[PDB]
Design an enzyme around this catalytic site. Sequence first.
Site, PDB file in Angstrom:
ATOM      1  N   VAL A  26       0.702  -1.267   0.061  1.00  0.00           N
ATOM      2  CA  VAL A  26       0.037  -0.067   0.198  1.00  0.00           C
ATOM      3  C   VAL A  26       0.828   1.293   0.145  1.00  0.00           C
ATOM      4  O   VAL A  26       0.338   2.186  -0.968  1.00  0.00           O
ATOM      5  CB  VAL A  26      -1.046  -0.038   1.058  1.00  0.00           C
ATOM      6  CG1 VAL A  26      -2.199  -0.963   0.590  1.00  0.00           C
ATOM      7  CG2 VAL A  26      -0.525  -0.600   2.389  1.00  0.00           C
ATOM      8  N   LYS A  45       3.818  -3.208   8.448  1.00  0.00           N
ATOM      9  CA  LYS A  45       4.675  -2.178   8.259  1.00  0.00           C
ATOM     10  C   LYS A  45       6.395  -2.801   8.793  1.00  0.00           C
ATOM     11  O   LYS A  45       6.476  -3.519   9.718  1.00  0.00           O
ATOM     12  CB  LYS A  45       4.703  -0.863   9.254  1.00  0.00           C
ATOM     13  CG  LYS A  45       5.962   0.082   8.904  1.00  0.00           C
ATOM     14  CD  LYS A  45       6.131   1.256   9.740  1.00  0.00           C
ATOM     15  CE  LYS A  45       7.255   2.082   9.415  1.00  0.00           C
ATOM     16  NZ  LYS A  45       7.593   3.019  10.692  1.00  0.00           N
ATOM     17  N   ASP A 157       0.950   7.706  12.496  1.00  0.00           N
ATOM     18  CA  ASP A 157       1.979   8.632  11.886  1.00  0.00           C
ATOM     19  C   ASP A 157       2.790   7.702  11.133  1.00  0.00           C
ATOM     20  O   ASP A 157       3.479   7.078  11.556  1.00  0.00           O
ATOM     21  CB  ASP A 157       2.668   9.160  13.070  1.00  0.00           C
ATOM     22  CG  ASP A 157       3.898  10.231  12.706  1.00  0.00           C
ATOM     23  OD1 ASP A 157       4.052  10.345  11.260  1.00  0.00           O
ATOM     24  OD2 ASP A 157       4.404  10.909  13.503  1.00  0.00           O
TER      25      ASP A 157
END
Length: 328
Positions: A26, A45, A157
């Site tokens: 993504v 991540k 974030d």
Amino acid sequence: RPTFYRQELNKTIWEVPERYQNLSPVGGSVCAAFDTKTGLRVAVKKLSRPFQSIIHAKRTYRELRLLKHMKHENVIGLLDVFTPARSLEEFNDVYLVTHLMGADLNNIVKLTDDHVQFLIYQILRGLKYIHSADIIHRDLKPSNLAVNEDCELKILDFGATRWYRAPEIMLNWMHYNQTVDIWSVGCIMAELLTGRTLFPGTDHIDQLKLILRLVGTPGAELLKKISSESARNYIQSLTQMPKMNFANVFIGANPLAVDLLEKMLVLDSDKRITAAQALAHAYFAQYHDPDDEPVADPYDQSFESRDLLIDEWKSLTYDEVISFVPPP
Ligand SMILES: Cc1ccc(-n2nc(C(C)(C)C)cc2NC(=O)N[C@H]2CC[C@@H](Oc3ccc4nnc(C(C)C)n4c3)c3ccccc32)cc1
Ligand SMILES: Fc1ccc(-c2c[nH]nc2-c2ccnc(F)c2)cc1
């Protein structure tokens, strides 16, 4: 210890537990995956070379420690954290797992007054929590707000930023406070109501001029708080400007929305509404429940004052991976 499998996606190697299937890019780089253990879709991540420098190593530790602490409906939280490494010596990769929301607030924003209430209510409810841990986000903007199909919202974030930044940050004040985040929420709320960037500055000087045009140049009370001679010489040398009538500028918006915008976009950060005060504002009467707006457990950020070796930051990070307990 789970069984890992290895694949390449966009020049990046992913080595993850077989639990996680169907990896698709993504965005660190980020993949969407299917968590076969829970039946939910996740975002994973992978930290890019997390120990390349003392600053990377400390960033690695900082993100893992923050994400392990955050347990709130409107703030990113950790489902899992893993490494294919089987020892501290071999440890050189960190993967973080969270719930996949599927869009950001730009993506949404392609909205009724009721939509704006619900979206800003959720941002403020997450910010109350974050601010209660003595954390400042410092980069709130639409692309750091993840939204699912139910318009449920989480702050995160990723690491133009300047458009949502507080004017005291454009001025390089080193002592700015949590209300820099409330400025950002103000900028976001204005953009959801009007469908335009409130302050689309081209640089730090352009950004400050667009801001002072709406909120006026500093008054005497604020000028006396400015230590920098060069900052004062510059600001006080501009054509002086009154605060505009927010009722005229945002004409057509729910006057209750305009009233809250004025409390968020006060130029003097000492006079801005806090997140907890904003939740009690009449604009959120349909959502506000003071019994369902929790605060955070104490957050130890003492590590931020430390100057450690890369190996020390790495071992601390490694211990944080090992001690991780998933949410029920
Ligand atoms: C050096 C440092 C950097 C960031 C931080 N930090 N500080 C905070 C708060 C808000 C102050 C508490 C949060 C973080 N870190 C952080 O948010 N990680 C995200 C970054 C991308 C994110 O990717 C995602 C996640 C969910 C998601 N849902 N939809 C989609 C799009 C693909 C549409 N998502 C896309 C992510 C996926 C896993 C795991 C983590 C993450 C602290 C220190
Ligand atoms: F043009 C300006 C002048 C002041 C600010 C400002 C807003 N809130 N707090 C400050 C501030 C306080 C103390 N020192 C400073 F440098 C800035 C923002 C833009």
